[PDB]
Ligand binder design. Structure first.
Ligand code: HEM
Length: 154
């Protein structure tokens, strides 16, 4: 699958807004993920102890990870499809070290879409959400292909 330039423009336009507050968006997205699919939290030995949303919001450690995650995702999105080099190490660490099922990657995509829709309604209408979903599906498809090559189900 390939996104059109018009689709990439919609994706990068809303991403530019996300970049005005990377730490805040990182926090919102991770918390959304954990609240919607609590089982994902078990994969983070570093955050498994957090019991409430209040504790998550206060964790400087969780905020730091959110920044790291969004910065990596941003670098990938800006490649507009030419992300093979950036994807390799990420696929390897998540398949071999962290052991993240492809199913959890879908939950992740859901969380990002929910937060963008909540914080940027004006720049995240139907067309823009469709473009973002397509970009995230592209990423998931490529990561899934790499998982297989690396010897991990998904
Ligand atoms: C767009 C998808 C995602 C991106 C871009 C992303 C990115 C990253 C990055 C950059 C790191 C640090 C470097 C590394 O270890 O490779 C990381 C670590 C990690 N990721 Fe992801 N990640 C994604 C999805 C997920 C999901 C869905 C889970 C599980 C629900 C997950 C679990 C982990 C874990 C357990 C670590 C280690 C955290 C620590 O202990 O410091 N990641 N991820």
């Amino acid at each position: 699958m390939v996104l059109s330039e018009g689709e990439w423009q919609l994706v990068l336009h809303v991403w530019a807004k996300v970049e005005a507050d990377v730490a805040g968006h990182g926090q919102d997205i991770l918390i959304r993920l954990f609240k919607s699919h609590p089982e994902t939290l078990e994969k983070f030995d570093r955050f498994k102890h957090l019991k409430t949303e209040a504790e998550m919001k206060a964790s400087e450690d969780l905020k730091k990870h959110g920044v790291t995650v969004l910065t990596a995702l941003g670098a990938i999105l800006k490649k507009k499809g030419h992300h093979e080099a950036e994807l390799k190490p990420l696929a390897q660490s998540h398949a071999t070290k962290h052991k993240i099922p492809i199913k959890y990657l879908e939950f992740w995509s859901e969380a990002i879409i929910h937060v963008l829709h909540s914080r940027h309604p004006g720049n995240f209408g139907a067309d823009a959400q469709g473009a973002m979903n397509k970009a995230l599906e592209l990423f998931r498809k490529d990561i899934a292909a790499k998982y297989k090559e690396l010897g991990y189900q998904g």
